[PDB]
């Protein structure tokens, strides 16, 4: 159904056959990043739920795999499994908690 990620398609009639018009989605402009498998926060390994960890040199974010949309790393979009001693390439970073600003207010 077309070269790329298939989106929608249309038929058209023709003599002795049919013609399809395949609408597809293709990525356009990419840029390099530095990535990590997990993040070690006070002895807990955090993995992304639906996404991938990225870095703009100094700060760490989590974003979609098919579109660059940075978000703050939070326990809402990450889940905890195991320790920091088994994952190869786990980095040290902090994980934001949503209850902290709403507990003091």
């Amino acid at each position: 159904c077309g070269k790329g990620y298939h989106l929608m398609s249309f038929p058209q009639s023709a003599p002795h056959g049919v013609v399809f018009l395949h609408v597809t989605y293709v990525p356009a402009q990419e840029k390099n990043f530095t990535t990590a498998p997990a993040i070690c926060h006070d002895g807990k390994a955090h993995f992304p739920r639906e996404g991938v960890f990225v870095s703009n040199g100094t700060h760490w974010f989590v974003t979609q795999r098919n579109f660059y949309e940075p978000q703050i790393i939070t326990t809402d979009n990450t889940f905890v499994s195991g320790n920091c001693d088994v994952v190869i390439g786990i980095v040290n970073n902090t994980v934001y908690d949503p209850l902290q600003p709403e507990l003091d207010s």
Partner: protein, 99 residues
């Protein structure tokens, strides 16, 4: 020497044409497909080739079949050893059996 088979085939008007692509060009195409698949993943078949580490690509592959991606990162050495043993088993089975 003696009478061959293709030579008597040729002498009676039967001609075999060479293929358009040689074997080294097919090997170059196969090498390009391997170099795309190992490095970029499935991204090179849908546009521009975007690099990714192979552990994170294999985590995407495990996440596609319904297994959580933490199973890879806690069993990476075992999975690499199993893949290497399977590749060696295919090599030995091709070297031994000719059928």
């Amino acid at each position: 020497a003696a009478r061959d088979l293709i030579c008597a085939q040729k002498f009676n008007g039967l001609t075999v044409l060479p293929p358009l692509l040689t074997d080294e060009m097919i090997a170059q195409y196969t090498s390009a497909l391997l170099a795309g698949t190992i490095t970029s993943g499935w991204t090179f078949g849908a546009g521009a080739a975007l690099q990714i580490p192979f552990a994170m690509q294999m985590a995407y592959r495990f996440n596609g079949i319904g297994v959580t991606q933490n199973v890879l990162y806690e069993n990476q050495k075992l999975i690499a050893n199993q893949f290497n043993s399977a590749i060696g088993k295919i090599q030995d089975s091709l070297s031994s059996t000719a059928s």
